[PDB]
Design a protein around this nucleic acid. Structure first.
Lengths: 225, 154, 129, 334, 378, 99
RNA sequence: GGAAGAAUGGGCCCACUGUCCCUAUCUACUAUCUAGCGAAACCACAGCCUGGGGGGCCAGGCAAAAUCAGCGGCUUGUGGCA
RNA sequence: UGGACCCACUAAUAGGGAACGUGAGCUGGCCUACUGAUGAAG
RNA sequence: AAUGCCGCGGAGCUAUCAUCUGCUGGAUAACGGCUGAACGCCUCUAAGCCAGAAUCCGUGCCAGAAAGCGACGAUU
RNA sequence: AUGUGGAACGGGGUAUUGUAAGCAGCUGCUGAGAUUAAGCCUUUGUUCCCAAGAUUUG
């Protein structure tokens, strides 16, 4: 687990997207964040510096996995062409034209199990299942439609809002087939997805995240070893 | 930091290398600077320089030697304003040499005019009777209309 | 930061709240960070922090001079790409000075200028258009 | 009220912009020009990548309004000599060329046709008779004078303008010794100097001209000089591939469909300027290399155009060229 | 706020009054205008004095309102009773000045002539100056109090803390200096640490405040702090008696100080070797003692890559630095041909989005379409 | 990329026109002011003679790919050939419509 | 935007509006010119400003005809008495 | 500075004068200037 | 139908409702110093010098003397 | 004051409105018709105009 901040904000998840095989970074911002990502997992997985739709909210607006990556249809075709050039050939990128523009904030996807907002269109869910090659379940996290932003998903564990019930958390963990912990990061911030990003082997959290929260996240994700 | 935090940094790191000769240099050339002060400045800050220079000059000389129908004046109880009315006077005893704020029991006579004496107007030189039990007529040695206080001598 | 963008929400205006916090209608009082201009009422627009009072909603929340961020605008303003944008109504969010909203969701599309400027607003956004 | 400095608000005494300030000479530098004078035709808008380092809009797409100024190559017709004196710059003498362009002769005459065209006739013969006298004057210029300006005029024939009078003006020749400037002026007699000589598709130029007139204090028709105003492109309309942005290809010409409003069709060398310029359409403008030396990033960055718009400025046009228009529209009876 | 001298404060107040209010009043104006001018100057003088007094009162805290540890230390190290007396004297002086100003303003309300106003204006200033001059020692005490308060630390008894007290120079300060990043100077002279030193420390993801205490005014301050503090005692007894105090003397001192050590975890540190032996000379066991004291006070597999199992900022800084460095996206591309990666592409031609209508299969489709078109034409 | 007008159904170049988004996350681009007002008044494009929708339905008419030099070069020539072939069919269609 | 200075008006509220932000545009007339006709008040003499004794005086600054159009005229920061 | 001593922004919302400030800019309890437009003449 | 009513309406006008642009050299005050007497020391000062304020004066920006002037073309 | 001259018209291009009247059989003519510079662009289009009158100038 590495703690860092983008510009002057520790909300790394909004400004960057981390997958199990690729990393998404913003363009025109602080070069230190790109250097930190390159030093952490650049030599292991690719890190692409590009903006979707000309914005630095690519992390909080785009959703994807190691198998496939989904971007909003509003993204420029020129941006899509650059993404394919940067991304490896085995990485699948598909444009999603759905009633929900924020793919990342609405749906959080893991390498095997994905949970999406109940309002997602059937065609988008079929496209997401076809692209990510994972099971997609339309449910809610802590009674919030923005499951992809208020909750964090990872292969070795999951993070949920601290207000989630134990029975609901147990049901979600059983459904996701992975351990789940309900809590807050970035010193009590309830946007776990916006405030934390964890990969299969590495995790990147905000620079202002509490040590106890960082220790809890490392144990939950088994990133200590 | 804690306690006299700059007093162990000096203890552990040392002093500004060139502070002492700078302060020695400042303590020397200030003599020329002081004279240049009086030859350039003007106004109140120059006036404030003047008497403060002489104050320490004479003090130094001492140590080396040792080496509408209304009342326009304050009254005691036309129209006499309540604010202008006064009942306490800081009359100073002559033999005792102690100034005490005594109540104005009454006014004996006002030298300005008998009408002022009838009105009990407090004026300089007017005779006023004040109780001396805690210690009698007394003459006002000041003008309360300008001084703002009933200053008198027993 | 944020570039020059058309201001069309002057003081003494009623503006609609689009979160689940229970607030419905918002009354503008003053605009943060306004210059000392002569005879020019400060205005508001998407992504701008202003002082507003909840006209209707939860009684405890209202009667408080609190910062508000506008997220929707009727007026047509130019985006730096060269296209003009306008929305069906004026919508804002209930937010503390730190930059956190009491509510936990937003309704309808969200201007990317508001979303990019305030990262947690984008976190709460589900439709950014 | 407005600025106190720009007072009085009286109408300009010059129809065409006059360059009062010129870049400082440097003999170490080679001989080069400093000022240009073209014609403002109109404006369009272009699409361009914005490669501004450190900005939030870094390495992405931005739209910028541009102005189109036709700049046909001038004809150098003469040189003048200037002497630095305790009373300022004084004109020592002036030498010209032999075959003056006929538009220049229109400048000297208010009623050309009625006149017997007697301008410079005896000067022409005395040059052909004895070039020694001219050589002596050029000897005077190269020896005594300190600031040298060449006489240049707009060649208005190839422009689509009703006016037939050439706008004559002087351009400083900065660089080299005095004799070097005169020799450069001599070898450039009677020939043409292109716009590409002075500006290089990315340079720091100051546009000068007389602003338009709003009618009656006076409101409009004053002399003005805008600073900054970076160049975006120096086109060459003589090439049929003049606009032809590399990103879009889309074979086209700078002239908007139906021609520039109240100007016509631009055919010759033209310059693209960001923002706006003083003065209305079909008016002569004057450009000059920026006086100061600033390496601000907004003045040093390179520019590679993405796409320019050649739509119909007349009305709400929506078509770039008839080649791309015809197949979209259904085949009409004509 | 800083505490100025009595003479300096009067001059600053007088200068500020003259600089802000006008000082040019011709005698030919109305009596009310002269009366208004004199009153405004007096009112400004009263306001400036009132603002200074209020700022002093606001800056001065309340001993009762302070925490029990802070108040006891303040009383011991600053004579809170004397400080309270001085503050009340200043408050009484401020009230007396306000009453005098109100009386002067009321007298000025019935002004008659310019000389009467001028005499009244001088009289008010002189009375205020005498009151300010009389309140001279209070300023000196306040300045000393401010300096002592500024040097004083911020006690946080709510958080976890470790109090080290006992015989002077028994190595407790050295252990505290080693445990926490705070470094308090130690000298061979006894009672070198006149004031307590607090050093933050981290242990088991918890913040511990290592606070040293004077060996046993300094002893009284150390006792008062230990009296009201949620911290564990760290009584260090010199086993080798190298601190100058005998083992029996240290034990007797620890027994006497046990009333303050009650309701807390007591650690018996055998210096210069809970009873913990710590070799002060050998600097051994300090970490173990600190740890003991801290303890006493208290199907989705992860596809980890082989590279994971087994900088950009520097590059940008070296070339042009931040804000002057342009990163080219062509380099960070997986294009097979390096020339193709560094070259541009056709975006839109002839009114058609070519980039949106060009596919890899078009290489063979175009040839097939050309053959199909020829067949259709034929 | 030049978008297609919602009402006018024509090419929309960057800069001109306006963009209108809806509550259902549907964004409509208007080619010109008249087209924007036409969509403002909810005029049916199939009921508008000057709209390509009526012209069509009245008898009157996502995965990015890796770039290749050869593919790009042939794409431009094919587009020109496609336009030439398509234009001829319309001329025949217009002749049939007139006849 | 909607009282921050037309609506139909309705029941403090609601609606409404260039009152305002912040003015912009248009039309008509007046204004303007040309032709003709054609006054009266008013008038010691006139008419550039600073300073000194106002426009006329003294010492300065300046100073180019004829005209058209909008349009002005001593006092300060320190109380008194013994 | 915006609003009825106040309550917020802002970097601050400094003090005055034009002796009856500007009541012949403002309200309540001919000629000479200035701005512009032409202009005969060495 | 004194511009009957309504929709759109180019060109013009205008929009801090739309866009563009808004410098760079010297001499200074406070002040920091250097050399250095007066005054065999010392001393920013006396003779001198260096640095230094959104300050001052120029550079640029506009007007161009209608009684300032120049180069040049023709000259019944 | 005889010319890639000028002008009036007209053609083409460009544009606004919305598909005319009429022929007809909603549809076809017909994405037509009308207007298009009076402060748009161009003119191998037809026409006439002109190598002119007066005033002051060493």
């Amino acid at each position: 687990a590495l703690r860092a901040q983008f510009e002057n904000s520790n909300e790394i998840g909004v400004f960057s997207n981390l997958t199990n095989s690729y990393a998404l970074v913003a363009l025109g911002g602080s070069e230190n964040f790109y250097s930190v990502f390159e030093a952490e997992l650049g030599d292991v997985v690719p890190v692409v510096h590009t903006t979707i739709g000309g914005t630095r909210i690519i992390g909080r607006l785009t959703c994807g996995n190691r198998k496939g990556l989904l971007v909003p249809s509003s993204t420029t075709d020129n941006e899509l062409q650059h993404l394919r050039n940067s991304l490896p050939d085995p990485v699948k990128i598909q444009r999603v034209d759905e009633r929900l523009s924020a793919l990342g904030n609405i749906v959080a996807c893991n390498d095997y199990v994905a949970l999406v907002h109940p309002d997602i269109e059937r065609e988008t869910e079929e496209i997401i299942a076809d692209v990510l090659d994972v099971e997609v379940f339309r449910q809610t996290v802590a009674g919030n439609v923005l499951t992809g932003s208020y909750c964090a998903l990872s292969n070795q564990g999951a993070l949920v809002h601290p207000r989630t019930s134990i029975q609901e958390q147990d049901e979600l963990s059983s459904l996701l087939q992975v351990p789940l912990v309900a809590g807050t990061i970035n010193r009590g911030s309830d946007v776990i997805g916006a405030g934390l990003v964890v990969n299969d082997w590495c995790a990147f959290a905000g620079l202002d995240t509490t040590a106890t929260e960082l220790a809890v996240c490392e144990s939950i994700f088994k990133l200590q070893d | 930091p804690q306690n006299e935090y700059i007093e162990e940094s000096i203890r552990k790191h040392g002093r500004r290398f060139d502070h002492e000769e700078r302060k020695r240099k400042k303590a020397a050339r200030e003599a020329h600077d002081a004279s240049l002060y009086a030859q350039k400045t003007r106004g109140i800050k120059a006036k404030l320089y003047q008497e403060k220079r002489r104050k320490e000059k004479i003090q130094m000389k001492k140590t080396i030697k040792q080496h509408k129908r209304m009342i326009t004046k304050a009254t005691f109880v036309f129209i006499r304003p309540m604010a202008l009315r006064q009942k306490k006077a800081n009359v100073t005893h002559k033999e005792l040499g102690v100034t005490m704020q005594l109540p104005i029991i009454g006014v004996k006579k006002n030298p300005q005019s008998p009408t002022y004496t009838q009105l009990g107007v407090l004026t300089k030189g007017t005779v006023i009777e004040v109780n001396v039990s805690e210690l009698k007529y007394a003459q006002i040695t000041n003008n309360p209309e300008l001084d703002g206080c009933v200053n008198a001598l027993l | 930061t944020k570039y020059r963008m058309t201001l069309g929400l002057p003081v003494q205006a009623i503006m609609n709240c689009a979160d689940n916090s229970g607030a419905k209608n918002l009354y503008i009082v003053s605009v943060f960070g306004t210059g000392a201009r002569l005879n020019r009422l400060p205005a508001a627009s998407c992504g701008d922090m202003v002082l507003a009072t909840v006209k209707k909603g939860k009684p405890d929340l209202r009667k408080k001079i609190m910062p508000a961020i506008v997220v929707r605008q009727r007026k047509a303003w130019r985006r730096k790409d060269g296209v003009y944008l306008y929305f069906e109504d004026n919508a804002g969010v209930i937010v503390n000075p730190k930059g956190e909203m009491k509510g936990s969701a937003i309704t309808g599309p969200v201007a990317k200028e508001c979303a990019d400027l305030w990262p947690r607003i984008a976190s709460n956004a589900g439709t950014v258009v | 009220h407005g600025s106190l400095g720009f007072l009085p608000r009286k109408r300009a005494s010059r129809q065409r912009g006059k360059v009062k300030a010129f870049p400082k000479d440097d003999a170490s530098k080679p001989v080069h020009l400093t000022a240009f004078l073209g014609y403002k035709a109109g404006m369009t808008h272009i699409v361009r990548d914005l490669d501004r380092p450190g900005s939030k809009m870094h390495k992405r797409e931005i739209l910028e309004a541009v102005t189109v100024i036709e700049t046909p190559p001038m004809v150098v017709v003469g040189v003048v000599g200037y002497v630095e004196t305790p009373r300022g710059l004084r004109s020592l003498t002036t030498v010209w060329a032999e075959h003056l362009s006929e538009e220049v002769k229109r400048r000297f005459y208010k009623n050309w046709f009625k006149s017997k065209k007697k301008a410079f006739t005896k000067y022409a013969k005395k040059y052909a008779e004895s070039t020694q006298s001219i050589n002596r004057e050029l000897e005077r210029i190269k020896k005594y004078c300190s600031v040298v300006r060449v006489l240049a005029h707009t060649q208005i024939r190839k422009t689509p303008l009703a006016q037939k009078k050439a706008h004559l003006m002087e351009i400083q020749v900065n660089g080299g010794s005095v004799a070097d400037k005169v020799e450069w002026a001599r070898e450039h007699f009677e020939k043409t100097v292109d716009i590409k000589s002075t500006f290089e598709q990315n340079e720091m130029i100051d546009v000068i001209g007389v602003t338009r007139g709003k009618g009656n204090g006076n409101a409009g028709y004053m002399h003005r000089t805008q600073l900054n105003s970076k160049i975006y492109r120096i086109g060459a309309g003589d090439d049929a591939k003049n606009a032809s942005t590399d990103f879009d290809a889309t074979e086209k010409r700078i002239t908007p469909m139906g021609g520039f409003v109240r100007y016509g069709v631009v055919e010759n060398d033209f310059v693209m300027l960001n923002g706006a310029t003083p003065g209305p359409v079909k008016r002569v403008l004057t450009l000059r290399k920026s006086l100061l030396t600033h390496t601000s990033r907004k003045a040093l960055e390179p520019v590679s155009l993405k796409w320019i718009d050649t739509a119909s400025k007349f009305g709400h046009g929506r078509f770039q060229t008839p080649a791309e228009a015809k197949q979209f529209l259904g085949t009409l009876k004509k | 706020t800083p505490i100025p001298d009595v003479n300096t404060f009067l001059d600053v107040v007088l200068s500020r009054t003259q600089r802000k209010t006008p000082t040019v009043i011709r005698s030919g104006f109305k009596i009310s205008r002269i009366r208004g001018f004199y009153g405004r100057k007096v009112k400004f003088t009263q306001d400036t004095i009132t603002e200074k007094l209020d700022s002093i009162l606001q800056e001065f805290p309340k001993l009762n309102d302070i925490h029990p540890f802070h108040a006891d230390l303040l009383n011991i190290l600053y004579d809170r009773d004397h400080l309270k007396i001085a503050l009340s004297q200043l408050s009484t002086a401020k009230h007396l000045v306000e009453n005098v100003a109100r009386d002067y303003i009321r007298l000025l309300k019935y002004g008659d002539s310019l000389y009467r106003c001028k005499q009244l204006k001088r009289a008010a200033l002189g009375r205020m100056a005498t009151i300010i001059k009389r309140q001279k020692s209070s300023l000196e005490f306040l300045e000393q109090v401010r300096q002592h308060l500024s040097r004083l630390p911020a006690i946080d008894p709510n958080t976890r803390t470790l109090l080290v007290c006992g015989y002077p120079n028994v190595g407790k300060s050295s252990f505290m200096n080693k445990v926490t990043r705070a470094q308090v100077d130690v000298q061979p002279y006894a009672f070198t640490t006149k004031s307590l030193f607090v050093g933050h420390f981290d242990y088991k993801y918890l913040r511990w405040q290592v606070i040293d205490t004077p060996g046993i005014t300094i002893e009284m301050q150390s006792i008062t702090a230990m009296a009201h503090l949620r911290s564990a005692v760290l009584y260090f007894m010199d086993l080798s008696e190298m601190c100058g105090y005998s083992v029996a003397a240290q034990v007797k001192l620890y027994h006497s100080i046990k009333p303050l050590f009650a309701n807390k975890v007591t650690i018996l540190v055998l210096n210069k070797i809970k009873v913990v032996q710590t070799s002060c000379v050998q600097d051994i066991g300090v970490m173990d003692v600190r740890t003991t004291a801290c303890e006493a006070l208290l199907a989705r597999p992860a596809c980890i890559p082989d590279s994971v199992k087994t900088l950009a900022r520097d590059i940008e800084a070296a070339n042009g630095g931040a804000g002057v460095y342009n990163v080219e996206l062509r380099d960070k591309y997986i294009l097979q041909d390096p020339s193709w990666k560094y070259d541009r592409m056709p975006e839109l031609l002839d009114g058609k989005n070519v980039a949106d209508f060009v596919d890899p299969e078009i290489e063979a489709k175009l040839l097939a379409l050309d053959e199909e078109e020829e067949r259709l034409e034929r | 990329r030049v978008h297609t007008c919602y009402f006018c159904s024509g090419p929309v170049y960057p800069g001109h026109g306006i963009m209108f988004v809806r509550n259902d996350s549907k964004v409509f681009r208007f080619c010109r002011s008249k087209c924007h007002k036409n969509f403002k008044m909810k005029r049916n494009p199939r009921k508008v003679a000057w709209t390509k929708a009526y012209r069509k339905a009245h008898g009157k008419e996502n995965v990015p790919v890796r770039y290749d030099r050869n593919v790009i070069a042939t794409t431009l020539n094919a587009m020109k050939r496609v336009s030439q072939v398509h234009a001829k069919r319309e001329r025949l269609f217009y002749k049939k419509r007139l006849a």
